[PDB]
Amino acid sequence: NILRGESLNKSLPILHEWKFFDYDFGSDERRQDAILSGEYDYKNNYPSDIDQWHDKIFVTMLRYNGVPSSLNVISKKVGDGGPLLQPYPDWSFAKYDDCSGIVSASKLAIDKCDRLWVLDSGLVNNTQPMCSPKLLTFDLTTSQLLKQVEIPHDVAVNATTGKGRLSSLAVQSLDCNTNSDTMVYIADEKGEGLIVYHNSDDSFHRLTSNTFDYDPKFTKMTIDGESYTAQDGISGMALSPMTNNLYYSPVASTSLYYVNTEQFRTSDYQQNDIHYEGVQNILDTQSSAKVVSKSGVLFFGLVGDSALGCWNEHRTLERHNIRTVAQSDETLQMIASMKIKEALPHVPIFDRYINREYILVLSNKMQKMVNNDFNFDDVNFRIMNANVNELILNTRCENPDNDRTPFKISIHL
Amino acid sequence: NILRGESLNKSLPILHEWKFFDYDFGSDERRQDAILSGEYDYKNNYPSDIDQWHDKIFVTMLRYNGVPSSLNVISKKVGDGGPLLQPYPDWSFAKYDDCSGIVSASKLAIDKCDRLWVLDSGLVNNTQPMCSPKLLTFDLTTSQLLKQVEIPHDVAVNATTGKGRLSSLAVQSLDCNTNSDTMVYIADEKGEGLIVYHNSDDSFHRLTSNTFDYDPKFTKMTIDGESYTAQDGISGMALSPMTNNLYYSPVASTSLYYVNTEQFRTSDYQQNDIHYEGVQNILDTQSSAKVVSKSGVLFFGLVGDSALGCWNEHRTLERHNIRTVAQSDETLQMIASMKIKEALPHVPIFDRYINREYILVLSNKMQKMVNNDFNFDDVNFRIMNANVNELILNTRCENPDNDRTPFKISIHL
Amino acid sequence: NILRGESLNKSLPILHEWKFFDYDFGSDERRQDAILSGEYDYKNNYPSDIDQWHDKIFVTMLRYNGVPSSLNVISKKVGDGGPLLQPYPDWSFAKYDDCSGIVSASKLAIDKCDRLWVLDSGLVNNTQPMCSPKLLTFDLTTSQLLKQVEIPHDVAVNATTGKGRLSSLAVQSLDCNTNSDTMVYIADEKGEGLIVYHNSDDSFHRLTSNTFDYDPKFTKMTIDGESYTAQDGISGMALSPMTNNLYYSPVASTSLYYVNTEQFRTSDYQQNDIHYEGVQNILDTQSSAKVVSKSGVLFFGLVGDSALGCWNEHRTLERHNIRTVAQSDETLQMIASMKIKEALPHVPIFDRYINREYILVLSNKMQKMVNNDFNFDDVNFRIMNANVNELILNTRCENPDNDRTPFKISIHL
Amino acid sequence: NILRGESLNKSLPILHEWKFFDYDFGSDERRQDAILSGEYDYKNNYPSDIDQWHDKIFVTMLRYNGVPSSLNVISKKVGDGGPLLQPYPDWSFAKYDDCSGIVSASKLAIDKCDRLWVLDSGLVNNTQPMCSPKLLTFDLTTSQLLKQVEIPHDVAVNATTGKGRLSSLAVQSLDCNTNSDTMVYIADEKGEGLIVYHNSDDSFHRLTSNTFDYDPKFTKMTIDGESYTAQDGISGMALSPMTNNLYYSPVASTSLYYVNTEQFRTSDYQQNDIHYEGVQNILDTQSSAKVVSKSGVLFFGLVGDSALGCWNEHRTLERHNIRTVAQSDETLQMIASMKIKEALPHVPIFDRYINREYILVLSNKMQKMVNNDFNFDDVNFRIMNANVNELILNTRCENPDNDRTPFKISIHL
Amino acid sequence: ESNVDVVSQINSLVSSIVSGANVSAVLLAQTLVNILQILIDANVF
Amino acid sequence: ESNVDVVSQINSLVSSIVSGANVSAVLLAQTLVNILQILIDANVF
Amino acid sequence: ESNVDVVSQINSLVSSIVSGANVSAVLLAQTLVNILQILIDANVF
Amino acid sequence: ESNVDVVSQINSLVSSIVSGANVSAVLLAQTLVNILQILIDANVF
Ligand SMILES: *[C@@H]1O[C@H](CO)[C@@H](O[C@@H]2O[C@H](CO)[C@@H](O[C@@H]3O[C@H](CO)[C@@H](O)[C@H](O)[C@@H]3O)[C@H](O)[C@H]2NC(C)=O)[C@H](O)[C@H]1NC(C)=O
Ligand SMILES: *[C@@H]1O[C@H](CO)[C@@H](O[C@@H]2O[C@H](CO)[C@@H](O[C@@H]3O[C@H](CO)[C@@H](O)[C@H](O)[C@@H]3O)[C@H](O)[C@H]2NC(C)=O)[C@H](O)[C@H]1NC(C)=O
Ligand SMILES: C=C(CC[C@@H](C)[C@H]1CC[C@H]2[C@@H]3CC=C4C[C@@H](O)CC[C@]4(C)[C@H]3CC[C@]12C)C(C)C
Ligand SMILES: C=C(CC[C@@H](C)[C@H]1CC[C@H]2[C@@H]3CC=C4C[C@@H](O)CC[C@]4(C)[C@H]3CC[C@]12C)C(C)C
Ligand SMILES: C=C(CC[C@@H](C)[C@H]1CC[C@H]2[C@@H]3CC=C4C[C@@H](O)CC[C@]4(C)[C@H]3CC[C@]12C)C(C)C
Ligand SMILES: C=C(CC[C@@H](C)[C@H]1CC[C@H]2[C@@H]3CC=C4C[C@@H](O)CC[C@]4(C)[C@H]3CC[C@]12C)C(C)C
Ligand SMILES: *[C@@H]1O[C@H](CO)[C@@H](O)[C@H](O)[C@H]1NC(C)=O
């Protein structure tokens, strides 16, 4: 039903791939010293989120014992395992012992203001909170730390359970003029909560609901046959530009919900007022990461079937409309990050001749990380690029099209 | 099943359209004189076949009482009803009273030799044979009649029934060098026969089989609700460049057959030897016209459902594989001609960046012609252009694709 | 004084050169047949006038016994002696036996109407009049004989002496619109007369004066040491576009005269009325050919000194102002034709950045022709091209210049 | 004789011109403060030398009481009097009170190493020595003071007279590779001496001769009628790249001498050994500034006749060969600086199509400065640019030319 | 030049090119000028 | 674009090129557009 | 220039353009030269 | 392409242009390619 027949075994073009992660320390002797000192270990590097800016591919690494730097940009030099990473901006921010630098970069987001938003989980080994979580704003043109904010402890974790790990970050800007009125949403799965931060107000508000909680029935997740158990709440938030709707789905459930950000415009923040609209059990498997294109199409990742599914916002939300586009067991093990970008430079007149939206997907084998069974002789981590219009063409997810031009150009990285 | 859900109400871009057909006699007074003399009547002009050459759109008109010229090229001048036609090459060939000129041009075909092949039905009113049928070869660069051959009477019509009308023409060239070894296939529905003409041998051979005969059960054809009865044999031949297979299907049946042209290479032409391979009743409705692209995809026209269907040659021939791409009651009433062309100039290196094949489809309302109920206040005849790769993308008909380039360009007229 | 010091031994770039003249009869066998029949002889070909049109170099040959064609265009094929000539337009006009074709082309002129004006001397061997002289107008775009006029016998030759040979032709057009009001001037040295032909009136008028007569003192002319005696009248007419003044000088004198064409505008043509303004004995040697550029500079050829001299019309006419630009004994033996052209296409805005006027000069050794002493192992005939502005720069002949642009471009063939 | 007839009243294109000199202090209030403090006075600014680098025009100002900065680059902002100057590199070097900055920049020179050589006269009011003379080497790409050397007192001034003012500076580089072997020549007129500085040896050597001394007979100099008396020695040194000959002429004499730099290659520096080859009294008037182009043409300035003269090195040195090119009383009052540059970027293949050398000449009215009679309502100081090849074309100074290309391009600023 | 006019010119030029007819030089130059002007207006360079 | 304006732009561009400075891309493109438009107006093609 | 090399150059140039980075002039000129040479070899003009 | 060959091609092309004949497109394109290649070799860009 949901799994489309033609989608079977279809893969995506691979922009980059790594057998493992190697860092550009400089000379080979410096790499040897780093390995000897225990700073760098190739068995404890796992990608969390990726992003792109004009020539740069930023990748976030979960802060384990052997991680040299949490946030790294892809460098031109290519190692045997894969392309070499380079600390960003420099090694000064990589030093997290003082906690001045980034401890652990969880997710990334880039707005139209050409600003990089970095979320610091603070957790080390993803289970031990070392330092306070941070929201960092960097200027991508000057490579400087524009702003740094510290998340309050009370809003970060539940007062009852006492545990909380930030998982997803989304940035919305009603107006990115001289003063950017940006409302940042941070979803913490361990706390099963949502945090709304108003940049203008410099205020954090915590919201909780029964929808954010996990379902014990669907905790088990089977990827490529191997099964692992995880108990996490709300994660994978995608904000639709067209409808201003923030979508979400608990990690341990198949139901899909969404909320309207217009309810958050009121400074009142009335508790129990927020109305969450969702459908219960519309998917056979869980959803890992979601992203909404400006055309109005939502892409999500089916973990159990190891596939990519799409849904058109204009059409009704039901199992009939939901369809898959890409299916591959090896190419798409676990989708951890999806980012939709557009071609540049922007020309208003020529937009009719060009399909500008292209999607970047990160695939890392999380079931191997959980069970500590990684074969470093194969390609473990992949980054793929695809064209949205040609990926959703002639399907249920396609938008009403009009062929008004003699030629059409499809653009992807 | 065969009718795909997304294909519903989908239309194609319209290159040209006519409320009725008007000819460019020159001055308005000449048009008035032609109308007064009875040479030109706007109620007796119906398109049969279309073709394109570098700037020209050739259209064939069935020779009725009021037809000024059977074959006409689209001219730059545009009348109120539609773009004006112009006799080709001149008015000398339009004069069919002496029979020197073309009496009635049934079908057209263009080879890679830049030669135009014209089939003369000879029939006037499509029921009365006036002059002998002809095969004409014109040079499209010099606009001269290169060659003219006359079809023998015995091979033209059945000796028993005594009736026969040529319906379909296909041209195959094993080698179009200085001497063109071209085998021309002419399918006559009224005679239920096939004629193979060898240009090198200057020989015509007639072949008949039970497959070429019509089925009385499926004589009735319903277009847009209105139903008409027709009893015709084999028509709509398409020759696949990849497999050298000539496909066909009787007008009054749903079965689809094909033959291999390699059996015709032997000069023996052993009777009852030719093996025709086909499937019985794989379509709900009849097929009007068929065309095979160089990639290996066959497009046919479902008359009853008023749609366009496709089938991939690589995949097995069955109802499961057969799917529709375009469905429209008004836009596609009756598909009388389909031609697949490629973009020019040919560049071998850049072929990976461009989808070159584009299809041209002619739609005329035949059910109105049969019942003599034509509303000349609306758009009766249409010509549409589409891109094959984007039309068959993400369907059963698509070929195994590989996205090896950052950008892809789709080209259609 | 007149001979400038820096001008000594200065030469001009050579566009083309011939040891002798060879014609492109076609195959070598045709050339052999022509030589055997006596039609073609390489010892009796001498250039008279040259002209250029967009790719073509027209050359006129005096009609001797062995001349195949009087008027010939330079062809692409190159013989051992030099580039091969080709009859223009075809061999039909080369056949002068019927007198329908050109007997002997004396001089050429091209107007802004893109028309070629050909003067037919009629004389064979330059001493025997065979057929009547003709004025021919050809269209250089269609290669057709637009018009042909026959000069009356009475105006052609003196009634008293009875001898007359047309030597120089000049074309002036007050308006070259749909009807070209062109006044053609033909100077005959043997008759010592001038003929004014009005194309609109189709009338020829003959004018004579004491200035047109020769001086017996200066009959002897010494070129490169070798001296020959010639008794000829007015020749070498140049019409200044700026001042509408026709300049002339008798072959056997050094005085230089000019007349105003405005006196010829009156249909009266009052005899003895025409006022000729000139200076007596301003040159050490005789002047062969003259040409006036549109800027207002007159170039003439000093036969005795074998040099090229210039005079600015704005400045006063005296020996002080007259100066030489090019001096060379071998390169410039006898200057028989000079034509000043301009670069194309014409762009009004860019004229300030480009010096457009370039001069073409023909050099043939006339003293060798008179004495019948030609060394065919050397380069006898030459065609040279030069840039006028750079040739007259920083001299008495230069016009007041203003360097208003950062860059200046000099153009010559 | 020397004054060519056509050169009369000929002027040169003016790149820039000033009624007076105004500096870009910034805001108008800063200019008002500078004027009030006495730092800036418009009556005490006189140009000494000019130079050009890729977009910059460096101008040197004699250090008087009211001079804000000795060395200034032309800025984009344009004042009412003329284009505004800007201190170079900044105001730090303009502060000469500490003597760290430039006291008085006398002359400038730019080598192929992209280095600026600045000579500091040290004299204030051109009669009082305040600080020691300096040789400064600046990098024109980084705008930094690469090197600074101090000239010894003994070699700077005569031991007997005790007076000496540095007047001319020339830079020669046998090899401008990583280590630049540059021999700098400084001619001091007041000391009537020459100083050779070897950059590799860091050694200064002083040479004197009877030729360097002035002639009392020619002390008086008449410019534009007004006469002033000056007693100065050797000045205006030009080094020929082709012949490696340093030319010179005393200010108060008309004789012209030159020396060969190869004699200076020996580290011995044998006294009275150096052989100076010159001609006595070959000019009617004195020579102010000289410059030698790479083609081999020397340009000098005739002060008395207010003209520009040229001499070809290949031809013999005599009054017959020496000729003038530009003559103008108002445009060229007193030529203080001449620099010959070439077009960029350098393309070896295209050099045949382009005349690359262009000369820049500075004209300031020195006779007005001496007599303190300056009309600030008129254009006092001018900078002119001309093309060398077109300036010397068709004269005695021209080099043997060959027109081997259809088009020639002349380039000047 | 109107934007719709530029779009129509581009659509005609591309159709003429892909059709195989002889493309006129003046039309191609005019289309190039219009496209370059539009790009300049967008500060692409 | 006025003809005098085009002449001034050409004179500035050529001077900047021969001077050796870094020529801006936008100015070069604008000058090229103006020159092509002038050539088209003259029916050069 | 090898055909595969030209294809790689085109793929790198288009990716750099659509990425938004500053495209080097020399690389663009070299790609243009290669494309024009290929078109000339195909008798497009 | 040899440098002398490029010079000869440029000399023929300029002469054909200034003469007024119809300049072939293929020759102009080849000359443009050669000139651009020479400029690239000189690091003009
Ligand atoms: C026109 O003439 C041709 C003969 O040249 C006729 O073709 C023949 O048509 C009959 C049926 O009408 C065929 O009989 C069938 O044979 C198959 C076996 O091949 C058998 O299974 C069927 O039950 C039936 O008996 C016959 O084979 C066929 N001739 C050949 C050579 O194949 C044609 O029918 C004539 N047209 C009309 C309108 O009658
Ligand atoms: C500054 O000091 C220098 C010496 O270092 C002086 O140079 C000397 O000048 C005298 C004339 O004033 C020269 O005498 C002349 O010698 C030539 C032969 O070379 C002779 O033919 C003349 O009749 C005359 O006697 C002397 O040679 C020259 N020194 C050298 C080494 O050449 C210079 O004059 C001093 N400056 C002033 C203003 O006095
Ligand atoms: C066809 C070619 C050359 C490829 C070129 C002409 C195509 C391809 C990509 C197009 C740009 C896509 C994005 C964009 C971004 C958009 O904002 C403007 C158009 C532009 C620049 C397209 C311009 C045309 C491009 C560069 C050869 C290789 C056969
Ligand atoms: C992107 C553009 C300009 C459109 C141009 C660069 C694109 C479009 C069509 C492409 C040709 C298609 C066919 C073909 C036929 C093929 O054989 C060669 C490539 C070619 C000529 C393409 C060249 C590039 C074209 C002309 C603007 C309007 C934004
Ligand atoms: C500098 C170049 C290229 C030479 C080109 C750009 C120069 C030379 C001749 C100029 C034309 C002359 C005539 C004319 C005729 C005039 O009416 C318009 C300008 C034009 C076409 C000039 C255009 C610019 C030309 C072609 C390379 C070889 C270094
Ligand atoms: C003719 C034109 C355009 C002017 C252009 C094509 C001409 C003029 C200057 C030439 C450069 C001079 C210097 C040089 C420096 C030399 O090293 C390379 C040639 C070059 C760049 C010439 C190139 C051709 C130029 C730019 C229009 C205005 C009618
Ligand atoms: C003129 O120059 C040529 C070429 O250098 C030379 O051969 C000839 O002798 C020169 N003429 C004279 C009279 O010296």
Author numbering:
A (entry chain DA), B (entry chain CA), C (entry chain AA), D (entry chain BA): 20 to 432
E (entry chain CB), F (entry chain BB), G (entry chain DB), H (entry chain AB): 33 to 77
Publication text:
Royal jelly (RJ) is a gelatinous, protein-, carbohydrate-, and lipid-rich secretion produced by the mandibular glands of nurse honeybees (Apis mellifera). At pH values below 4.5, as found in native RJ upon acidification in the mandibular glands, MRJP1 assembles with the small (5 kDa) RJ protein apisimin into long, hetero-polymeric filaments that can reach lengths above 1 µm12. These filaments were recently shown to be responsible for the high viscosity of RJ, guaranteeing that RJ-embedded queen bee larvae remain stably attached to the ceiling of the vertically oriented queen bee cells. Here we present the structure of native RJ filaments using a combination of cryogenic electron microscopy (cryo-EM) approaches based on tomography and helical reconstruction methods.
The resulting map, calculated at 3.5 Å resolution, was used for rebuilding the structure starting from the previous crystal structure and including the peripheral MRJP1 protein loops responsible for filament-forming inter-subunit contacts. Overall, we did not observe major conformational changes of MRPJ1 and apisimin in the RJ filaments with respect to the crystal structure determined at neutral pH. The resulting low-resolution ab initio reconstruction showed the overall architecture of the purified RJ filaments consisting of an H-shaped unit oligomerizing into a symmetric helical assembly by stacking interactions. The RJ helical assembly retains the D2 point group symmetry of the tetramers since both of the 2-fold rotational symmetry axes are orthogonal to the longitudinal axis of the filaments. Although the intrinsic flexibility of the N-linked glycans limits the map resolution at those sites, we were able to model one NAG residue at Asn28, two NAG residues at Asn144, and two NAG residues plus a β-D-mannose (BMA) residue at Asn177. The densities are ~25 Å long and are located at the center of the oligomer within a highly hydrophobic environment formed by the apisimin alpha helix 2 and the outer 24-methylenecholesterol from each asymmetric unit of the tetrameric oligomer. Although building an atomic model for this region was not possible, the highly hydrophobic chemical environment and the shape and length of the observed densities are consistent with a fatty acid with aliphatic tails of 12–16 carbons, or possibly a mixture of those. One of the contacts is mediated by homodimerization of MRJP1 alpha helices 1 (α1, residues 47–56) from neighboring building blocks that mainly interact via hydrophobic interactions involving Gln51, Ile54, and Leu55 of helix 1 as well as Tyr61 in the following loop. The helical assembly is further stabilized by a homodimerization interface present on the opposite side of the MRJP1 protein, involving homodimerization of a short turn (residues 280–281) followed by a loop segment (residues 287–295) that includes His294 and Asp292.
